[PDB]
Amino acid sequence: FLSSEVITQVRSLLNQGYRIGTEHADKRRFRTSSWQPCAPIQSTNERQVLSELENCLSEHEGEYVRLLGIDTNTRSRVFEALIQRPDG
């Protein structure tokens, strides 16, 4: 389930040297913005990153998943996007 849009965003973040992360929220936790981190994607190899992202989506079926770009020098989030949303 990786769209062309999401892949372009991930490749750009990697090209700029940013870390990829994800976080998730079930329907109930989304209502209060109560996100939890997913398993880290400690790779900067695009093929492996994308493979791990697809794993993250399939492991959180029915949940909200937000993709993160992270500046590892400063810990700041430089990018966010909701990449999985339940139907509704």
- CA dist 19 and 74 (Å) reads 12
Q: In whole angstroms, how far apart are CA 50 and each of 4, 6, 10, 21, 60?
A: 11, 9, 8, 11, 16
Per-domain residue ranges of the chain: 1-88
Structural biology method used: X-ray
- CA dist 32 and 59 (Å) reads 22
Q: Which amino acid is at 73?
A: N
3 state DSSP class of 41 = coil
Q: In whole angstroms, how far apart are CA 56 and each of 19, 28, 73, 74, 77?
A: 16, 19, 25, 25, 19
- CA dist 26 and 84 (Å) reads 11
